[PDB]
Design a binder for this molecule. Structure first.
Ligand SMILES: [Mg+2]
Ligand SMILES: [Mg+2]
Ligand SMILES: [Mg+2]
Ligand SMILES: [Mg+2]
Ligand SMILES: [Mg+2]
Ligand SMILES: [Mg+2]
Ligand SMILES: [S]
Ligand SMILES: [S]
Ligand SMILES: [S]
Ligand SMILES: [S]
Ligand SMILES: [S]
Ligand SMILES: [S]
Ligand SMILES: [S]
Ligand SMILES: [S]
Ligand SMILES: [S]
Ligand SMILES: [S]
Ligand SMILES: [S]
Ligand SMILES: [S]
Ligand SMILES: [S]
Ligand SMILES: [S]
Ligand SMILES: [S]
Ligand SMILES: [S]
Ligand SMILES: [S]
Ligand SMILES: [S]
Ligand SMILES: [S]
Ligand SMILES: [S]
Ligand SMILES: [S]
Ligand SMILES: [S]
Ligand SMILES: [S]
Ligand SMILES: [S]
Ligand SMILES: [S]
Ligand SMILES: [S]
Ligand SMILES: [S]
Ligand SMILES: [S]
Ligand SMILES: [S]
Ligand SMILES: [S]
Ligand SMILES: [S]
Ligand SMILES: [S]
Ligand SMILES: [S]
Ligand SMILES: [S]
Lengths: 169, 169, 169, 169, 169, 169
C-alpha cells in the first residue's frame, strides 16, 4: 500500500471520490447558469456573476478533496461529469430555487460522509469536513434563502428583478 | 498613379469612400438622437450620453477609413451627408431599436467590403476590417441587444425607463 | 408648446438651425483640407494639423448652438451637410485664402444673426453671439491673415513653404 | 430568434459547442495528470504545476468559446465531460508525449473549425480562431516539443528527471 | 520528421527561407546607405540615422522569420547575402528612391507568400504575415513617399537638402 | 581625393575592407548556430543565447571598422557575405570547437593587419587594433577554451550537457 496511509478506511476513500464528482457536477451546473444569464435575451449580469462565483467555489471544493485524497494516501479516481439536464434556467428566481436544492443535496451528502468517517473513527476526516465544507454549506444555504426572500419582495419579475439584479452586481 | 499604391484595386478604393460616408451618416444620426434626449420635454441624460458617445465613435470610424485611403494611395472623395429622415425619435426603446438596425446595416456593409477585398486578394484591407471594424460592430450589436432586453424588463416606460436611464448615466 | 420657452422668437430659432448647418459644413470643408494635406504627394503635416483643429473647432461651434436651441426651448432641425465644393485644395496658400473667405462668410452670417436678435430684443441671444462666436471669429480671421502674410514672405512655394509648414506643426 | 445574430451559420454554432466540450475534456485530462504527479509515490512537483497551468488554460479556452457563442447570438449546449482515458500517467516523459498528442489533436480540430468558417465567409469567427487559439496552440506544441527533447537529454529517468523537474518548478 | 510540425507545407517552408534572405539583404543595403551618408564628403547625419534604423528593422524582420521557421518545425537554410547594388548612393533623393523600390519589392514578395499560405490553407502563416509584416510594409512605403515629396519641395539639393536632413536628425 | 586623408595607406584601407567582411561572415555563422540550438529537436537555450551574443558582438566589430574607414577618409567597399559553411552544428561541444577555430582565424587576420599598419608606420591604426580588437579577441579565445574544458568535465553529452547549458543561460 501507500507508505503514508494510516487509519484511512477504504469506504472513506471511495466516498471522497464520489464527493469530488458531485462538486465538479455542481460547478458545471453553476457554469451553465452563469452563461445563461449572460444571454442577450436574458441579460441579468448580477445573476451571472453570482453563479460564476459559485461555479469557481465548487471547483475549489473538488480540488480540496483531491489534495486530501493524496494527503491521506488514497487514489483519486475521476469519473465523467454529467451535463446539467435542463440548461434553460428560466427566471432568476427559478435558478435560485434550483441552486438552493443543489446546495441542500451537497450538504446532505457531506453529512452522510461525516457519519461514515465518524463510524470508522477517522477524526482527521471529520475535522476536514467540519472546517472546510460543513460551515460553508450552511452559509451558502442561508445566503440563497435570504436572496429568494428579497427577490420575492422586490419582484420577482419585471422592475423588481431588474433592481435586485443590480444589488447582486 | 501614386508612388505608394500597390495591390489596391479601384473597387476597394470606391468602397472605402462609400463606407466613409456611411459612418459619417451614422454619426449624424447619433448626434440627432443625443440632442433629442436632452430636450426639456424628454430629459433622458443617460440615453443622451450613450448616443453622443456612439456619434463620436462613428466619426472616428470614418476618419480611420480616410487615413487608410491615404495610406494605400487612393483618393478620398467626400459626399453629402444626408440628414436623418425622422428626427423625433420617440421613446428610449424606439431609439435603441433604430440604433440596433443602423449597426446591423453597417455590419452588413462591412462584411460586403471584406468579401470584395478578399476577392481581389487584398490581405491588408481584410486585416484592417477584422481588427478595427468587424470586432467592434459585433460588440456594439450585442451591447444594444443587452440594453433592449434590460429596458423591456425594467420598463420600458415610466419609472422603469427613469431607472434604466440612471444606469446609462 | 415648450414649458421653458420665453422671449425666444421664431426668427431666432430658424436662424440658429441654419447656423448649425453652416458650421457643420465648414467643419466638413476643414476636414477635407486636413486629409488632402496628408496625401503622400502633398505631405504638409503642419497645414493638415491646422485644418484638423479648425474642423474640430467648427464642430464644437455647431454643438454649442444645438445645446443653445434646447436651452431656449426651440427645436433642432438638422439638414443635409453638403459635400465640400472641391476635394483638391492646391497649395498651402490657396487653402488659407479659402479658409479666410470661409471665416469671413461665417462672420457676416453671425453679424446678421446678432442684428435680428437685437431687433427682437433678445439680450440672452446677443450675449451668446458676442461671447462665444464673434470674438473667436475675429481671432480666427486675424490669425489666418497673419499666416498668409508670413507664407508669402517665406515662400509661398518651395523651401519657404516647407519651412513655414514646420512652424505650423 | 436572436435579435443580435448576423452572418452566424448553424455549422459554426454546432462546432463551437463541440469545441467547448473538447477543451473542457482536455482541462479534465490535465487536472488528472497534475494530481497524479502530486502523489506521494510520484512526487514530481514541477510536472504537477505545469499540468495544473495547462488545466487552467484549457478551461479559459472553453469559457472564451461560451462567451463567443453568446456574443454571436448562438446557444450554448453543454455535454457530459468524459473521464480521462487513464488515471495513471506513468513517467514524466510519457505524460508529456500524451499532452503533445492532445494539443496536436485540439489543433487539428481548430484548423477544421477555421476551414468551415472560411467556407461560410465568417471573418469574425476566423479572426477569433487566429488570434485567441491557433497562436496559443502552436506555442504550446512547440513548448512541449522542447521539453521532451530536454527531458530525453537530461534523463528521462533518475537524477535527470529529478533535475528537469526542478527547472519546471 | 519533426515532432511539432503540423499543417506546414514544404512550399511555405522554402518561401520563408527566401524571405529571410530578402530582409537580410535589405538590412545590408540600408547599412551601406547609412555609412555612405557619414562620409566626410557627404555628411548627411539625418539620412544616416534614418537608414541605420531601417537596417536594424530589416534585421529584426529576418530574425522573426527564423524564429517562426523553428516554431512551425521547418528548417532554417541560410544563403549568401548579395553585396548591395551600389557602393555610393548619390543624393539623399536618389537613396530614398532606391529604398522605396526596395520596400515595394519586399512588399510584393510578402503578398505572394500570403497567397501561397492561403492556397495551402495555412491560417497561422497568413496571420503572421498580416500582423508582423504587411502593415509595417505599407507604413514604411507611405513614410518614404512622404519624405520624397517633402524633400522635392524643400530641395532636393543645396540648402533645402541641408534643412530636410535636420528633420530626420 | 579625401580632404581628411593623411598617412593612410591603401594597403590598410583594403585590409580594413576585408576585415569588415570577415566579421560580417563570423556574425552570420554565429546567427546560424544560435537558431540551430533553438530547434525543437536540439533545445539548448544556453548555447543559443551565447551564440546570439557572439553574433551581435561580431556585427559591432564590423561597424566599428566601417566607422574607422570613414574617419580616416578611406572608402568602404562591401562584398557578398558567404553562406555559413554548415547549417547543422552537431553537439554543443562541436559548435564550441568551431567557434574556437573561427575566433583564432579572426585573431590571426587582425595580427596581420597590425603588421601591415606597423610596416607603413600608421600608429593611429595600430592603436585602434590594440585597444578595440586584439585584447577582446584574446579574451574570447580564453573564454571559449574555458567553456570547452568545463563542458568536457561536465559532459560532454547527456545530463552533463544539460547541466552545462543552464550555466550559460
Ligand atoms: Mg479499510
Ligand atoms: Mg484596379
Ligand atoms: Mg415668435
Ligand atoms: Mg445557418
Ligand atoms: Mg508539404
Ligand atoms: Mg554579390
Ligand atoms: S460562492
Ligand atoms: S457557493
Ligand atoms: S470560493
Ligand atoms: S464562498
Ligand atoms: S456546494
Ligand atoms: S460607443
Ligand atoms: S457605437
Ligand atoms: S470610440
Ligand atoms: S466604443
Ligand atoms: S457603427
Ligand atoms: S482651431
Ligand atoms: S478655426
Ligand atoms: S476649439
Ligand atoms: S481655437
Ligand atoms: S467658424
Ligand atoms: S473660428
Ligand atoms: S499554460
Ligand atoms: S497548455
Ligand atoms: S492561461
Ligand atoms: S499560457
Ligand atoms: S489546448
Ligand atoms: S494550448
Ligand atoms: S525603421
Ligand atoms: S523600415
Ligand atoms: S523596429
Ligand atoms: S519601424
Ligand atoms: S523591410
Ligand atoms: S517594421
Ligand atoms: S519596413
Ligand atoms: S565574442
Ligand atoms: S558587443
Ligand atoms: S563581449
Ligand atoms: S571575433
Ligand atoms: S571577440
Amino acid at each position: 500500500a501507500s507508505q503514508v496511509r494510516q487509519n484511512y478506511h477504504e469506504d472513506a476513500e471511495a466516498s471522497i471520490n464520489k464527493q469530488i464528482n458531485m462538486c465538479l457536477y455542481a460547478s458545471y451546473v453553476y457554469l451553465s447558469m452563469a452563461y445563461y444569464f449572460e444571454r442577450d435575451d436574458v441579460a441579468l449580469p448580477g445573476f451571472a456573476k453570482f453563479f460564476k462565483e459559485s461555479s469557481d467555489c465548487c471547483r475549489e471544493h473538488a480540488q480540496t478533496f483531491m489534495k486530501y485524497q493524496n494527503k491521506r494516501g488514497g487514489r483519486i479516481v475521476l469519473q465523467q461529469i454529467a451535463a446539467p439536464s435542463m440548461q434553460e434556467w428560466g427566471t432568476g428566481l427559478e435558478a435560485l430555487q434550483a441552486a438552493l436544492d443543489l446546495e441542500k443535496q451537497v450538504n446532505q451528502s457531506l453529512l452522510e460522509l461525516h457519519s461514515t468517517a465518524s463510524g470508522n473513527n477517522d477524526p482527521h476526516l471529520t475535522k476536514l469536513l467540519e472546517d472546510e465544507y460543513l460551515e460553508e454549506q450552511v452559509d451558502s444555504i442561508k445566503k440563497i434563502g435570504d436572496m429568494i426572500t428579497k427577490l420575492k419582495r422586490a419582484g420577482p419579475t419585471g422592475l423588481g428583478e431588474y433592481m435586485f439584479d443590480k444589488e447582486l452586481n
